[PDB]
Design a protein around this ligand. Structure first.
Ligand SMILES: Cc1cc2nc3c(=O)[nH]c(=O)nc-3n(C[C@H](O)[C@H](O)[C@H](O)COP(=O)(O)OP(=O)(O)OC[C@H]3O[C@@H](n4cnc5c(N)ncnc54)[C@H](O)[C@@H]3O)c2cc1C
Ligand SMILES: Cc1cc2nc3c(=O)[nH]c(=O)nc-3n(C[C@H](O)[C@H](O)[C@H](O)COP(=O)(O)OP(=O)(O)OC[C@H]3O[C@@H](n4cnc5c(N)ncnc54)[C@H](O)[C@@H]3O)c2cc1C
Ligand SMILES: Cc1cc(C(=O)NNc2ccccc2F)no1
Ligand SMILES: Cc1cc(C(=O)NNc2ccccc2F)no1
Ligand SMILES: Cc1cc(C(=O)NNc2ccccc2F)no1
Lengths: 588, 588
């Protein structure tokens, strides 16, 4: 056990020092490497459980059992006297820089996971390159460094959500005594987009600064893995070349799908285009029913838009369907129109986008309802939100041997390793994993530490909490009620639930019984909490802390013995008592 | 053990049925009791692990070991045949109403704890009275049923906090694209007070409806305990009479203190007066530095007021002082003035309150700083927030034998029992307990179940989370950093911390490094989280869920392995890494 860990650690680390905190010979070597600007990992043996056993295993590489011992890319370099000899003789810089490869690590993809992995690897002395290229959308939209979340995802969508939430803050202000008249106030799309894009631009620049300050080589080029250690790159001038690397991390993400119907690619847009659109969309149709579809329809309606959503079957497939129906009912009562049980057949152009006067075009959408009736209506903008997919045929030569599943995602071990031993995959392209930004970041950072600092901790992908940022937000952690019932049986499941009303909604005359929460519990396991669900304001802030308790195995008794904070929405979880089986009403 | 539990349960319950879920004779007795509208507790012996032992112990009370067995106020009434006999002979109603006392329970005080205890007791058949009287403030202010939180505490203060938060929402809305101009909008104090008071009145009415629907006797009268079982009551016509009860719960709360200086009682006010004041306070001095003082100063400033706070020594004594100083620095940067190291000597009247034109008066405040320099300034309103105190000499004859501590609070066992065996105390008057509304509710409900339904569960008063609703909110759960170091020593304490910026503050151009969080941990106990602290928006929603994890013994490793929800403020707790001992900056 200990011998196999040490072997893997030594073969993989770029530069690593084995040390003890109390040793002045170790401190002497540490200070030399700091002066020479040589970054490295450090393993303090006096702070590990079996440090004595490791110290004896080191002799199988160095034939000494003392400390310090310095290694570079699998090779024992020397003890204190030897390292100072290389330093005194101006031979140290050359020894720590010799490698079979151009880089210790090449990351293909500069998004949530890839930037996290590359920066963390560099901190331990791995010579690292990060490659990023943004293929333009069909209408030509492109953006800077940082990935989907930063540029066309979590960041701009939550900022536009906040712009929509402020519409209701303006209405509430009158009831709390402020003198404004909400009915005389309007919204300016282009002013909002300019502020959002200025923030995104500051993130693009901050990531380039961060890579420079960690000595990471940033290449704005398209990468393609042609053999296990060779990456072909093509730059903005179509100059083609090859770089080599010891370890490879694939982190290229996904892009939006289009349906295979006439006019979709030519005349519609996706979320990739929405967040920098230079004109207000006008009367809008959203095709789809994912969290992306509902989040976008929701803020467009709150900004004052005329918005319709076309739903093939159900809302939020894969989420708790009682919660999903309450989400949609709120949206329908607050100005979002729905075309239910309906699909599109073709998009026809009636007017071209007026790019000079900054106005949308006009489109005729034809489709049909599931019974057989026809749909036909005119819209200024049509947004497709019908799923996302990777396109690893762009990234990955089939001769390399990296196995993909039937959806085109990478099949990985529980430590992110592919079927090719030096190649790993993280983020949205790792098959079977939750497709979320904090998951990609944790996977990338934890992987970098295992490769270059001898860490052993794995990423835990179970019970990862989520929040859907619809007009009324929906947070969740764990199983839906229907998945719990299918797994364990109805007689082994107890559900505690309640409506609630935020105190802030009282003076503002908002609804009494629309916010809702529940705990789905397993009777035969001490009433273990299998899933937590909340519909209400600030749902992400409410849910996050409970994710720690669920990770730890919280029971209903743990929620009961914990005391609430008053007045809050979250405290309602500490006093739940009405069960679904009792038939008693959950209203306030 | 079991036999001591059974004797206490039988002696104390008003009406109780010993039963098994599987027994049709028990079902027949349940159905008769429901038809006669006789409320009662039930214990299902087949749901307890020592149910066989309990069934044998019942025989020393009834001389039988079968189920069902019905008891009334410590007396065995009968089995199935006997209960049915009393019913068909119209004898049962008189039997179940036989009592040595007028009531099974008298609650003195109709606030957070007292209303909770009284309603819960009545559910198990306890004949219950709740007494409530509101002694007017020095200027004559009074209010309805529900206690301090409902009328002059948590509820109106958080509603006025929300009105203040909406000021910054109006400012933010411009940056997100909305057409309003914040500089032309003003606030109307009387409109806000009218809305707050209409909500408080709906709560007053709802509590009277709830007591009527639970068959609880509500007496709007002042109560005084004159012997262990006798309560003297004085009504609004000054009629004096005596009622008797088996169990007594003291739940009379506290009221604000005034300093002993000339003019304080005559010309100043307290929080009791603020929340229904018919005119805007105008230019205001708040004397004190408690959470009540800073919350009130904070929202008055956000509503456009000229506000000063006079601080004797420090802010928020008893809270973590690094967090208290950050709370005050934010207020001072956003328009609250502070007179530090200063106390008042006298209040002089310059103008009487203008009741006709609905305007405040004018006052001259004289004081001095700790070095002896003088303070002298004019204000329209002076609010004293210098602590709260019970006044149990008004509630409790000294000859009854209930022991008080040096501060005048009631000394209780861990099951809320006083030194008089049938008398219990809950809420703010229970010595040594956190003075919070959800604590009083849990204590009252749990106590009623122990008295009248044979329950055993105690209230857990440890690590109860809190939130201070200052303009930037401060949430906490567990020990302050200085208390942790005093208890375990500095070398056994590690502190992880970080600044953060809410995403909502980016486009709004608010501050980069004002929000802050830390985890105070114990090294020698697996890095156990001893205390959690957060300064930021929605801090009560952030903190609540983590209180369950801390109750369960969370360590830093539990926070690390839990994944964040993005984009949120709370997710910053899941990736903390900078220690105070490293000296590395917490800025982001
Ligand atoms: C509209 C929307 C909203 C979302 N909201 C949230 C939210 O609120 N919370 C949340 O947790 N998640 C959210 N997500 C999900 C989140 O955006 C993703 O889970 C995350 O971005 C995945 O990170 P990644 O590192 O796997 O890939 P990405 O961030 O997509 O980065 C991959 C990068 O690699 C580049 N690349 C691709 N091929 C190559 C190549 N051959 N050579 C070089 N570079 C290449 C891509 O152009 C891209 O820049 C949202 C997603 C969308 C679409
Ligand atoms: C300004 C302010 C803000 C607060 N904010 C919060 C907050 O945000 N969160 C929180 O958790 N806590 C808050 N608190 C504390 C909370 O109000 C108290 O902890 C809670 O009200 C205590 O409940 P209680 O049942 O002990 O007493 P109370 O609610 O004070 O009820 C006691 C009642 O008994 C009556 N009474 C007294 N003597 C007699 C008698 N002889 N006969 C009959 N009736 C009598 C009193 O008039 C009163 O109606 C706040 C307090 C204040 C002052
Ligand atoms: C807001 C949001 C995003 C997701 C998500 O990313 N993926 N779902 C998923 C879950 C578990 C395993 C595998 C998966 F693919 N869920 O909610
Ligand atoms: C020391 C003390 C005695 C009383 C007194 O008489 N209270 N009775 C009363 C009850 C209800 C409304 C109005 C009332 F006056 N108050 O304080
Ligand atoms: C054991 C213990 C805790 C306390 C106490 O400080 N209670 N009150 C309080 C605290 C924090 C915020 C708001 C509050 F009202 N007294 O004794």
């Amino acid at each position: 056990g200990t011998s196999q860990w040490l072997r893997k650690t030594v073969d993989s680390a770029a530069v690593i020092l084995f040390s003890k905190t109390t040793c002045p010979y170790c401190k002497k070597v540490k200070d030399v490497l700091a002066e020479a600007k040589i970054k490295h990992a450090t393993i303090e043996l006096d702070q590990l459980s079996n440090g004595s056993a490791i110290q004896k295993c080191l002799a199988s590489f160095s034939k000494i059992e003392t400390v310090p011992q310095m290694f570079v890319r699998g090779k024992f370099i020397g003890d204190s006297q030897t390292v100072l000899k290389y330093y005194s003789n101006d031979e140290l810089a050359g020894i720590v820089n010799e490698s079979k490869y151009d880089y210790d690590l090449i990351v293909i993809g500069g998004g949530s996971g890839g930037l996290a992995a590359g920066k963390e690897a560099a901190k331990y002395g791995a010579k690292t390159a990060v490659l990023d290229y943004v293929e333009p959308t069909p209408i030509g939209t492109t953006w800077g460094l940082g990935g989907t979340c930063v540029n066309v995802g979590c960041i701009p969508k939550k900022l536009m959500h906040q712009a929509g939430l402020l519409s209701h803050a303006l209405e509430d202000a009158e009831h709390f005594g402020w003198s404004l008249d909400r009915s005389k106030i309007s919204h300016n799309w282009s002013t909002m987009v300019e502020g959002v894009q200025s923030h995104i631009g500051s993130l693009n620049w901050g990531y380039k600064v961060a890579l420079r300050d960690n000595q990471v080589t940033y290449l704005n080029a398209k990468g393609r893995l042609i053999s296990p250690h060779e990456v072909q790159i093509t730059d903005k001038n179509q100059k083609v070349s090859t770089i080599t690397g010891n370890k490879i991390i694939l982190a290229t993400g996904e892009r939006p799908k289009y349906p295979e119907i006439p006019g979709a690619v030519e005349y519609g847009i996706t979320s990739d285009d929405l967040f920098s659109l230079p004109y207000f969309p006008g009367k809008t149709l959203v095709i789809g029913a994912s969290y992306v579809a509902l989040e976008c329809a929701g803020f467009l309606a709150s900004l004052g838009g005329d918005v319709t959503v076309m739903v093939r079957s159900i809302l939020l497939r894969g989420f708790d369907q009682q919660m999903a129906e309450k989400v949609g009912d709120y949206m329908e009562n607050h100005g979002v129109k729905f075309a239910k049980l309906c699909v599109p057949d073709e998009i026809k152009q009636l007017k071209v986008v007026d790019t000079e006067n900054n106005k949308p075009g006009l489109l005729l959408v034809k489709g049909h309802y599931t019974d057989g009736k026809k749909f036909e209506e005119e819209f200024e903008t049509v947004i497709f939100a019908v799923g996302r997919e990777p396109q690893l045929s762009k990234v990955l030569c089939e001769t390399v041997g990296v196995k993909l599943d039937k959806n085109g995602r990478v099949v990985c071990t529980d430590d992110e390793q592919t079927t090719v031993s030096n190649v790993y995959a993280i983020g949205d392209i790792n098959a079977g994993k939750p497709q979320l930004t904090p998951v990609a970041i944790q996977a990338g950072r934890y992987l970098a530490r295992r490769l270059f600092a001898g860490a052993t901790e794995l990423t835990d992908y179970s019970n990862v909490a989520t929040t859907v940022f619809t007009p009324l937000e929906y947070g969740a952690c764990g199983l839906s009620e229907e998945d719990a019932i299918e797994k364990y049986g109805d007689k082994d499941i107890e559900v505690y639930h309640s409506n609630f009303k935020p105190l802030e909604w009282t003076v503002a005359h908002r609804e009494d019984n629309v916010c809702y929460m529940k705990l789905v519990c397993r009777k035969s396991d001490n009433m273990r909490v299998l899933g937590l669900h909340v519909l209400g304001p600030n749902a992400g802030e409410i849910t996050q802390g409970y994710a720690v308790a669920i990770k730890m195995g919280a029971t209903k008794a743990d929620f009961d013995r914990t005391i609430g904070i008053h007045p809050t929405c979250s405290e309602t979880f500490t006093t739940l008592h009405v069960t679904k089986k009792s038939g008693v009403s959950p209203i306030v």
